[PDB]
Amino acid sequence: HHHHMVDAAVAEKLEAGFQKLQEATNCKSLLKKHLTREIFDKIKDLKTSFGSTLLDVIQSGVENLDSGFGVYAPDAEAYSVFNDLFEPMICDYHTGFKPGDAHPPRDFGDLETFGNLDPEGAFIVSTRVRCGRSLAGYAFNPCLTEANYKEMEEKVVASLSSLEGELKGTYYPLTGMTKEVQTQLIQDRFLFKEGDRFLQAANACRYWPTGRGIYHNDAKTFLVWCNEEDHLRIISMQKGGDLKAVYARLVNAINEIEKRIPFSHHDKYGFLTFCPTNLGTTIRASVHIALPKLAADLAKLAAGKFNLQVRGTAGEHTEAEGGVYDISNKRRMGLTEYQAVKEMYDGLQELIRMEKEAA
Numbered sequence: 001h002h003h004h005m006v007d008a009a010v011a012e013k014l015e016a017g018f019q020k021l022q023e024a025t026n027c028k029s030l031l032k033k034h035l036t037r038e039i040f041d042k043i044k045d046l047k048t049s050f051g052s053t054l055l056d057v058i059q060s061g062v063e064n065l066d067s068g069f070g071v072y073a074p075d076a077e078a079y080s081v082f083n084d085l086f087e088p089m090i091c092d093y094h095t096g097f098k099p100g101d102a103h104p105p106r107d108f109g110d111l112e113t114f115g116n117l118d119p120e121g122a123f124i125v126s127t128r129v130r131c132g133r134s135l136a137g138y139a140f141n142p143c144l145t146e147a148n149y150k151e152m153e154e155k156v157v158a159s160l161s162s163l164e165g166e167l168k169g170t171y172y173p174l175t176g177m178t179k180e181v182q183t184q185l186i187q188d189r190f191l192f193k194e195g196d197r198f199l200q201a202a203n204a205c206r207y208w209p210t211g212r213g214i215y216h217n218d219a220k221t222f223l224v225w226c227n228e229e230d231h232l233r234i235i236s237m238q239k240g241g242d243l244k245a246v247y248a249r250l251v252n253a254i255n256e257i258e259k260r261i262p263f264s265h266h267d268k269y270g271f272l273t274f275c276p277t278n279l280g281t282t283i284r285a286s287v288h289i290a291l292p293k294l295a296a297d298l299a300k301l302a303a304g305k306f307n308l309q310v311r312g313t314a315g316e317h318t319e320a321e322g323g324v325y326d327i328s329n330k331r332r333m334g335l336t337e338y339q340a341v342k343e344m345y346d347g348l349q350e351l352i353r354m355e356k357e358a359a
Contacts, residue, residue, distance in 0.1 A: 001047050001048070001049055001050065001051040002047065003046060003047060003049075003081070004045055004046060004047070005045060005047065006044070006045055006046075006047060006053045006054075006055075010053050010054075010055050011044070011045070013055055014040075014044050014053075014054055014055050014058075017055070017058060017059065017062035018035070018037070018040050020062055020065070021035065021061075021062060021065075024065050026065075027065045028066075028068070029061050029065065029066075029067045029068060029069065029070035030068070030069050030070055030071075030089045030092055030093060031058060031061035031062075031067065031069065031070025031071050031089070032061070032065075032070070033092070034085060034088045034089045034092065035058065035085055039084050039085055040054075042084055043081075043082050043084050043085060046081050046082065047081070048074070048075050048077035048078050048081045049077055050074070050075040050077065050139050050143045051143070052074035052075050052077075052078050052081075052139075052142065052143055054082060054085075056074035056078070056142050056143070056203070057071050057072065057073070057074060057078055057082050057085065058070070058071055058085075059201060059202065059203070060072060060198050060199075060201040060202040063197075063201040064197055064198050064201055067198060069089070069093065069275065069276065069277055071085065071086070071089060071276065072140070072141075072142070072202045072204070072274050072275055072276075073086070073140055073272065073273070073274055073275075073276060074139070074140055074141075074142040074143050074203075075139040075140050075142075075143045076134065076139075076140070076264045076266070076272045079266060079269060079272060079276075086276060087099055089276065090269065090276050090279065090333075093276070093277055094279070094280065094331075094332060094333040094334070095307070095330045095331055096307075096331050096333070096334045096335070097280070097333040097334040101268070101333075101334055102267060102268050103266075103268060103269055103270035103279070103280045103281075103333050103334060104270075104334075104335070104336050105336075106265075106270075106271075106281075106336070106337060107336040107337060107338055108247075108251045108254075108255075108336075108337045108338055109336065109337065109338025109339075109341075109342070110338070111244060111247065111248045111251065113342070114243050114244035114247060114248075114341070114342075114345050115242075115243075115244035117241035117242060117243050117244070117345070117348065117349070117352075118240065118241035118352065119241075119242075121240055121241075122290075123241065123289055123290055123291070123352050123355065124240060124241030124287055124288065124289050124290075124348070125239070125240075125288040125289065125290060125321065125324055126237065126238070126239055126240070126287070126288045127237065127238060127240065127241055127242065127243050127246045127287050128235060128236070128237035128246065128285065128286045128287070129235070129236050129237070129246055129247055129250050129283065129284070129285045129286075129341065130233065130234070130235045130282075130283070130284040130285075130286075131233075131234045131235075131250065131254065131271075131281070131282045131283055131284075132229075132230040132232060132233050132234065132271070132273050132278045132282040133230065133231060133232040133234065133254070133257075133263045133264075133271060133273075133282070134230060134231045134232075134263060134264040134271070134272050134273060134274070135152055135155070135156075135231045135232070135261055135262070135263065135264065136261075136262040136263055136264045136265075137262075137264075138152055138231065138264075140230075140231075140274045141199075141202065141203065141204035141205075141206065141227075141229070141274055142202060142203040142204060142206070144206070144207075144211075146207045146210060148211075149207055149210045149211025149212075149227065150210060150211055152211055152226075152227070152231060153173075153210075153211040153212075153213060153226055153227070155260070155261055156213075156224075156226050156231075156232065156261070157171050157213070157226075158260065159256070159257050159259075159260040159261055160215045160224060160257075162256075162260070163217075163253070163256060166217065166219070166222075166249060166252070167217050167222055167249070167252065167253050167256070168217060168218060169215055169216050169217035169218055169222065170215065170216065170218075171213055171214075171215045172185065172213055172214050172215070173209075173212070173213040174208075174209035174212040174213055174214070175209050175210060175212070175213075177209075185214060188216070188220060190214055190216055190220075190223055191214065192212075192214065192225055192228045194208050194209070195228075195229065199229060202274075204229060204274065211226065211227050212226060212227045212228065213225075213226045213227075214226070221236065221237060221238045221246075221249065222235070222236055222249055222250075222253060223235045223237070229274050229275065230273050230274050230275075230278065232257075234250065234253060234254060234257075235250075236249040236250035236253070241287070241289075241348075243287070243341070243344065243345055243348070247341050269333070270282070270333060277332075278332070279332065279333055280332045280333030280334065280335075281332055281333070281335065281336065281337045281340050282332065283329060283332055283337060283340045283341070284328065284329070284332070285328060285329045285340065285341060285344045286326055286327070286328045287326075287327045287328075287344065287348055288313065288324055288325070288326055288327075289324065289325055289327055289348065289351065289352075290321050290323055290324045291323055291324075291325055291351060291355050292322060292323030293323075293355050293358035293359070294323075294351070294354060294355055294358060295322075295323035295325075297358075300325070300351070302347075302350065302351065302354060303327060303347055303351065305347075305350075306343050306344075306346055306347030306350065307329065307330045307331050307343050307347075308327050308328065308329060308330060308343065308344065308347040308348075309327070309328050309329070309330045310325050310326075310327055311325060311326040311327075311328070312325060312326075313325065313326055327344070327347070327348065327351070328344075329341075329343060329344055331343065
């Protein structure tokens with residue numbers, strides 16, 4: 001496909017979408033904020049080599065005006081071709097990253113500098129680190145062919161099936177998934193299903209459920225989703241606060257996978273993903289921590305000095321311990337994997353120190 005020229009159908013649909021954006025003077029999306037007429041007029045007739053147009057970028061945010069972000073990348077090249085829109089959006093969303101920055105190369109860092117977090121079990125309820133990856137060479141969802149989905153899944157399965165030791169586990173395809181397995185995966189909170197209206201409207205569920213599946217280790221402390229939104233979503237998690245173990249498991253897993261499957265990467269934006277909220281390190285770390293003494297003061301948002309975000313957790317007495325907060329990394333881009341996780345580690349250590357010291 002050539003870099004220019006969209007057909008008349010695409011052009012008409014883009015203009016109507018832009019107008020809908022405009023008349024919705026109520027719309028809070030990043031798409032509406034950043035897709036100015038000037039930018040729209042500049043990029044509306046461009047296509048990637050896969051044939052993706054601006055409509056394949058913005059259609060979800062147009063159809064779902066309540067979108068928070070409102071664009072997706074239909075293939076890795078969209079990030080360059082439609083960069084006039086992607087760049088301001090990405091840089092608005094991602095704390096500490098600005099136009100002209102180059103996201104640093106991957107570096108998981110020295111695992112030995114993590115570890116002793118809450119061995120007592122007095123504070124941290126659970127620890128989780130999620131990452132995402134696209135496979136080098138493949139389009140993203142709106143552009144994948146049925147044979148692409150099958151081939152990608154075969155490759156992913158070959159790699160996960162070869163995993164040994166702590167990562168050894170089972171792959172469950174969505175194709176022909178039984179009621180029994182569906183139920184078991186729902187109990188585990190491991191099941192995904194056809195995407196919500198945001199993903200449907202992005203054409204991200206074509207050929208469902210071909211090439212979609214779920215892998216977890218026997219311990220249920222390592223989970224992979226194949227083709228849920230990104231080619232790969234990779235999660236390490238467990239009860240308690242052993243961030244070293246959680247992070248080491250994920251690092252080992254990603255290194256083993258990459259030995260067999262190279263990832264899509266970008267010199268400025270880091271690992272490329274279908275949703276640009278997942279760029280850079282792609283890291284989404286989350287620790288549930290009980291801080292009932294600090295809960296009184298909410299000068300807790302201390303966490304900010306380590307670039308960490310604090311969120312309350314739901315439930316009543318009968319369900320959940322009180323004063324438990326979800327602590328996560330605000331930074332995904334413009335820092336290495338090691339810096340992102342060490343920020344969590346350092347900040348949590350301080351929070352706990354503060355909790356022990358509070359009256």
